[PDB]
C-alpha cells in the first residue's frame, strides 16, 4: 500500500501508507520530505477536500491512488 | 490578419493537444495576439522552486517572422539579460515558418536546465558559469528567491493548478449524472472493502436510484438546487410559494447590501430554471440546462448568495456555531460567498430555511451496523429531497 | 454539573457529566439522547473544536456552560 | 469569455453612476479586460499628494475569477511590495462573483489610510510601522515624493479631475435644450437677488424665448453653430452662400498649412449639418444631431478651426488685439485650436468673418440700468442670429 | 492732447483727453461716443492691460497713441 | 452665506464668504487655507471658468454652492 | 467613440504613405490603440548608433485627447525623465484635435537633436546641458551606449531595413510576370556593356521567352514552383505522379519529425496550386494565383520544407558537399528552411530528386564566348523546365 | 563612375569604384570610411545578395546605383 | 596519381594529376572532360572549399582522394 501525490510543479512524490492512516499524519509525512509545514498544505483526492482528521480509507484511496498537493498561502 | 490569426489558433489547439505541465502559455483576455508564457524552474535547476513569466507577441504577419517573446520576471542567466531578452536564435535568424510557440517553448525551457555559455547574451554571467559554478548556482537561488518567489506569481501558478485539477475532474464526471441504478456504486468500491460494500447494501434497502454530481467543490449546492426543482417538477402549489420565496429574495438580499445589478443576473438564471420548471417539461430538459457550465454555475452562485443573505440576517443565532475567532460576515465571505469552496452543516441548515425547505440526508461513512443514518433538518419534517453524503462528497438519491 | 449543548437545528439538550469526563464519553452521552453516532459530531465551545481526547476540565468548561453540536458534513 | 464582457460593461456602468473623486479606474483604449486605475493620496496620509496608478486584467473567465490588480507606482507600505502586488485577500481566497471592481478599488483606497500589519506582504515596513511611527511616515512621505509625483502623474490625476467635474455637468445639462420660455431664467436666481431678476424682466422685454448650452468650455461654438444652422432652416439663399464658404473654407485651411487628413473628417461633419439643413427638416431632427457627443464636437472642432485660421490669416490685425507679448499663431495654438478652452471677444469677430454672418450678443451681468444692452459685431449691421452672454457662459435667444 | 482707440469691429474712434487723465475716465468717454459701459471694456495699450486706477502718462500714452478696445465676454 | 470647494483630492473645503466677493478674493482665502497660491488656482462653478476680477453674485454663486479648485502646473 | 479607430486608420495610412527612416511607429500586433515607436539616434547626436523604444496609447476619444507617448527605452536629456515621460506641450495643454501622431513623432525627433533647458523636465541635467555641454555628451553617450544598444533592438531596427528594400522591390516588380519577349532584357543592360549584351543574343538563340520573377531570397523556389506546375498544366500522367509524390511527401515529413499540424497548411497550398493545374486552367489563372502573397509564399515555404526533408533523409550524400563545418540539418536550419534565405546548386538538386523532376539551369555571367551553357541534373535527363541564372537571380526561361 | 550606399540610419555613404571592382574590394573601402570590419557588412544591389568574390559588372551596377549596408551582427 | 571527383549530379569523374597540380589546372581538367567553365566550379576537399591558387599536396590530397564538385549558383 503505497500512495502517489502531485505537486504545484507536476513533480511526484510517492509515500508509503496504510488505509487507517490519519491525513495529518500523511500531511506529516510530506513535511518530513518537502518541508512545507501541515497547515500549509490541502491535500485533493479525486476533487475532494480531505479533512485532517479523517483516514484514507475514509476517502476511498485505495493502493496507488493519486493525490493533489496544493499550497494554502498565507495571504501576505 | 486572416492566416496569421487562423494559424495562431491552430498552434493554441496544438498546444491545448498536449498540455505541458513544466511549460505553458495562453492569450491574454481577448488579445489573441498578445499571450503569456508560464513557465516553472525545472526541478535539480538553481531556478527550482521559481515560477517565470513571459510575454509573447506574434507579429501581424505570421508564422512568416517569429514570434517576439520575453521574460518579465527577472533572472539570472547567460543567455537572458536583466532587460528580458532571449537569445537563442530560433526566436531570430534561423526560425521556419514551420516551427511552433510550443517547439519555441520547451526550447527555452531546455535553456533553463542547459545554458549556453558559447554565444552568450551576458559576458559577465557567462564567464562566472563557466569558471565558478558555485557562484552561479547560489547567485542564481538568490535571484530566484528574490523575483521569481514573490505572492503573485505563486497565486498564479496555484490557479493553474486548480484549474488543471478540475479540467480533468470535469473529463471524468458530468456536472449532473443521468439518474442511476446505485448498484452502480458497488463498482466503485473494491470487494476487498466489505464494510463500505455492506453499507452500500443498507443504502439499497431504503434508496433505488442515484443521480451523481461533480466534486467540483459546489456539489452540495448543484444536488440541492437540482433535487428541489425537480421535486417541484409536479407539485402544482410547492412551485408557486417557491417560485415566490425566490422572487422576494432578491429584494431580500438587495436590501441587504449586496449589489443589484451583479446579482441580478444569477437571480435570472435562477428563476428561468424555475420557469423550466413551472410549466413541467421532463427531467431530461432541465438536467440537459444544469449540464450547462454557464447556467448550473450562476445558479450555484446564487444559492450561496441565499446561504450568505440567511446566515448574516439571522447571524446572531449561528454566531456561536462557528469554530474560529471570527465573526459572521467573515465566516460568509471566506467559507460561502465566493466559488468552489467546501460546505458545511451550517450551510444546509442555512439554505434550507431561506429558501424554507425540507432536506434529508444520508450519511454513509463507516458504520457500527451497516446502518447509514439519515438527518432530516427542518425539525421533523417530512422530507421529500434526499441527499447522498459520503465524505468529501454530496449526491442525490431517489427512493 | 450538569451541562447544556444547543444543536444547529435550535433544540438544546441537557447533559449529566463530571469535570473529568472526556468529549468522547459526551458524544456518546449526546448519541443516547439524540442517537447521533460519535464519529458523525463536532461540537464547539467558545469558537473551539474539542478533541476527542481531552476531559471537560481541560477546556474549562464549568458548570452550566453551553456547548454547540453541529455535524460532520463537509463537502463539495 | 461573452458574459464576462458584458459584466465588465455592467461594471463600468456602475463605477461611472457614482464616481469616487480620489480613485477612479476605466479601460485602456480600446481593451476591455486591460484598465488603468487612478488613486490619489488620501488627505491625512504621508501618501497626501501623490497620485497613485495600478493596472487591472480581468480574467478571460469572470466574475468567476478575480481581476489582478497591481500598482505600477511604487509605494512604501507593509501590505504592497516593490513588486506592485497588492496583499489583502478580497484579490485572492475571499473573491466571491458577487463583488464589484468598485469594492476592490475601495478596499484598496481604504487600505492606504489603514494598513494592516496583521497578515503583512513586507514584513520589514510592518515592523517598522508596528514599532516606531515617526519613521514610517517620513519614509513613506519621501517614497511619495520621488514616485508618485513626478511630471507624469499630476497631468492625468488633474485630467481625471477635470472628466469628472464635466461628467456632472454632463449629466446636469445636455449639450443643446429644447425651445424654452425664457421665464424659466426667473428660476435660475434668488428673489434675494434683484438685480439680476429685473435684467430678466428686461430681457423679457425684447426675447421670447431662451436655448440652453453645456458649460463645457465649448458653449460659445456650440450655440453660435445651432442657432446660424437654424438660421438657415428656411432662408434659400443664404444656405447655398453659407455652404459654398464652408465649402472653400477647407481649401483654404488645408492651403494654410492644417493637415488635410485630420480635418477632413471634422469638415464632413460639419457639411453634413449643413446638408440636414439643406432640404429643410424641423429643428428637432438637428437637434437631435447636436445632441449627440462627437457629431457636435467635431462641429465644434472645426468652428475652433475657421477661428484660427481666419485669425492666422489676418494676423497682422489682430496682432495688437491681444494682451500678453503671444504672437498671434500662439494665441491659436494656447486659447483657440484646442478643445473646452474659453473663447473671447477675439473668437466671436473671427469666426463671424470667417463664415461672413451676422452676429448679435446681449450682455447680462450688472446693469446701472435693467437695461442689458446688445453687441452687433459686423459693423451696423442687421443680426438675425441671437446670443446671451453671461458671465462664463454664453446661450441662444429667441426673438 | 488726442488719443486714438481701435475697435475690434474695424472702427476706429479719436477722444479727446490730458496725460492725467485715468483709464476708468477714458473708458466713460469712450460709454460716449459708442454707448459701451465701462465695466464691459478691456482696452489695451501695446499688448498690455490696461488697469483702471492709473493715469495715460502712467502706461506712458502720448499725443496720437493707438489703443485697443476689446469688449470682455469671455465665456464657455 | 458660506461656500464649499472641491480640491483634486476630493477633500471638500469650507469658505466664509459674501455673494459680493472678489473671485480673486477667494483665490486669497484658499491660499490662507492650503497654501496654493492664487495663480496656480483655476476656480469653477457649474461648468464656468471664474475670472479673477468678477463677484461671486455675477455668476450666480448662491448659499451653499459647490466650486471646483482645478491646479494650473506650470508647464515644467 | 469608433470614430477614434476610424482616425487612427487614417493617421497609420499617413504615416504609411511618406515614411520616416528614422522614426516610425505602428500598431502592436492586434491592437490599434497600442502603438510602439522606433525612433533612431540622429546622427551629429550624443544619442547617434541608439535605437530607442517609445509606447503610444491613444484615449478612447480620439483626436479630442491627446495621445499618451513614453520613452521605454532609458535616455539621458533634460526634456525626458527615467520614468519615461516626454515633456513637451503638444503632449499636453497645446494638443489640438488636427494635429497628427506623425507631427508628435518628428516632434520628439526634433527634441533629441536640439533639446529644451527652457522649461526643464529634469532641472539637473538641464543645469548640466546649459553650462558644462562636455559632460552633457559624455554623460548622454555613455547612456546610450548602455540602455540603447542592446541586442534585443538592432534585430528590430534591421528587421525594419529588410522590410523596406523588399516593399522598394515588391513595388518593382510582380511576385511572377507574365510571360515576356526576352528582347526585353537588352533594356536591362547598358549598350556600354558589350559582353553581357551578346549573352543576350546567344541566349536569344536558344530560348524564346522570358518570365521574370521578384528578387526577394525565395526566386528559386517561386521559378522552380511555377514552371514546373506550368509545365504539367498539359501533360495528363505526370501530373498524377507529381500528385502522388506530393501526397506521399508530406507524410514523409511528419515521419521525419516536422510537427504535422504547422505543415499542413503548407501541403494544403501546395495541393490546392495542383488542384487548380488538374484539371487544365489556362496558365493566367494559375499565374493570378502565384501574384497572391500568402498563397505563393506558402508554396515557397512548403517546397524549401521538401528540399530540407530529403537533405536530411540522404544526409550522409550532401554531408561533404557542405561548406563549413555545419552538420547537415544544422544547414538545413539555417541555410534553407527559413525564409528569404539564399538557394544554392545543393537546394536545386535537392528539390528536384524530393519531387523526383528534371531541370535545366542557363548559367549567364561573363563567357569567354557568347556561350552560356546549360546544366542539366538528373543526370543525363531530358528537362520541359528551364530556368535562367544570373548571379543573384533566377528567373523562367520558354524555349 | 561612382556609388552611393545606403547604411542603417538612412546615411548615405558616396564611393569612388569601377565596374571590374570586387565586392570584397567594396566592402574594404567601406571599412576604409566607417570602420565597419567586412565581414560584418552584407551588401544588397535591387535586392540581390552580393558575394564577397565576384564584380560589380557581373551584377549589372551602373553608374549611380544604390545600394545597401546591412550590418550581419554577431549572434551575441 | 590520379584522383575522383564526384558531382552533385551524382556523377563521378577520375582525372589524372600531380601532386604540384594547381586547383585552377585541375578545374580546367575538369572543363575538359565535363565542359564546364572554372569559374563556375567550386570544389570541396573533406569540408574545405579550395582555393584556386594553392596546389594539390597543399590540402593534402593523396593518391585516389576523392573531390566533390558544386556550381556556383548562388542566388535569391
Known amino acids: 500500500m503505497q500512495i502517489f501525490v502531485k505537486t504545484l510543479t507536476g513533480k511526484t512524490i510517492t509515500l508509503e501508507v496504510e488505509p487507517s492512516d490519519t491525513i495529518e499524519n500523511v500531511k506529516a509525512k510530506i513535511q518530513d520530505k518537502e518541508g512545507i509545514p501541515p497547515d500549509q498544505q490541502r491535500l485533493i483526492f479525486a476533487g475532494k477536500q480531505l479533512e485532517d482528521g479523517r483516514t484514507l480509507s475514509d476517502y476511498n484511496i485505495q493502493k496507488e491512488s493519486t493525490l493533489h498537493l496544493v499550497l494554502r498561502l498565507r495571504g501576505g | ?399
Open chain 2, 1 to 399: 490578419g486572416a492566416m496569421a490569426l487562423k494559424r495562431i489558433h491552430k498552434e493554441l489547439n496544438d498546444l491545448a493537444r498536449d498540455p505541458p505541465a513544466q511549460c505553458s502559455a495562453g492569450p491574454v483576455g481577448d488579445d489573441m495576439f498578445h499571450w503569456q508564457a508560464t513557465i516553472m524552474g525545472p526541478n535539480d535547476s538553481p531556478y527550482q522552486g521559481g515560477v517565470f513569466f513571459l510575454t509573447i507577441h506574434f507579429p501581424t504577419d505570421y508564422p512568416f517572422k517569429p514570434p517576439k517573446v520575453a521574460f518579465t520576471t527577472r533572472i539570472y542567466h547567460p543567455n537572458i539579460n536583466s532587460n528580458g531578452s532571449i537569445s537563442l536564435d530560433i526566436l531570430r535568424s534561423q526560425w521556419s515558418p514551420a516551427l511552433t510557440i510550443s517547439k519555441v517553448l520547451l526550447s527555452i525551457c531546455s535553456l533553463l536546465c542547459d545554458p549556453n555559455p558559447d554565444d552568450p547574451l551576458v559576458p559577465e554571467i557567462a564567464r562566472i558559469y563557466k569558471t565558478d559554478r558555485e557562484k552561479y548556482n547560489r547567485i542564481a537561488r538568490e535571484w530566484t528567491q528574490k523575483y521569481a518567489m514573490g505572492g503573485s506569481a505563486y497565486d498564479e501558478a496555484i490557479m493553474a493548478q486548480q484549474d488543471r485539477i478540475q479540467q480533468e475532474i470535469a473529463v471524468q464526471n458530468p456536472l449532473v449524472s443521468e439518474r442511476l441504478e446505485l448498484s452502480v456504486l458497488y463498482k466503485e468500491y473494491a470487494e476487498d472493502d466489505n464494510i463500505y460494500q455492506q453499507k452500500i447494501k443498507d443504502l439499497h434497502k431504503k434508496y433505488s436510484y442515484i443521480r451523481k454530481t461533480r466534486p467540483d467543490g459546489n456539489s452540495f449546492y448543484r444536488a440541492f438546487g437540482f433535487s428541489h426543482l425537480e421535486a417541484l417538477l409536479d407539485d402544482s402549489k410547492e412551485l408557486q410559494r417557491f417560485k415566490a420565496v425566490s422572487a422576494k429574495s432578491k429584494e431580500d438580499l438587495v436590501s441587504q447590501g449586496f449589489t443589484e445589478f451583479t446579482i441580478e443576473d444569477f437571480h435570472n438564471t435562477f428563476m428561468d430554471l424555475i420557469e423550466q420548471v413551472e410549466k413541467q417539461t421532463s427531467v431530461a430538459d432541465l438536467l440537459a440546462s444544469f449540464n450547462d457550465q454557464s447556467t448550473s454555475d450562476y445558479l450555484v452562485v446564487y444559492l450561496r448568495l441565499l446561504t450568505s443573505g440567511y446566515l448574516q440576517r439571522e447571524s446572531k443565532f449561528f454566531e456561536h456555531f462557528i469554530e474560529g475567532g471570527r465573526t459572521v460576515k467573515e465566516f460568509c465571505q471566506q467559507e460561502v460567498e465566493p466559488m468552489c469552496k467546501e460546505s458545511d452543516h451550517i450551510h444546509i441548515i442555512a439554505l434550507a430555511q431561506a429558501l424554507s425547505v425540507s432536506i434529508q440526508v444520508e450519511y454513509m461513512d463507516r458504520g457500527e451496523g451497516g446502518t447509514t443514518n439519515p438527518h432530516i433538518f427542518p425539525e421533523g419534517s417530512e422530507p421529500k429531497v434526499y441527499l447522498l453524503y459520503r465524505p468529501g462528497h454530496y449526491d442525490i438519491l431517489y427512493k
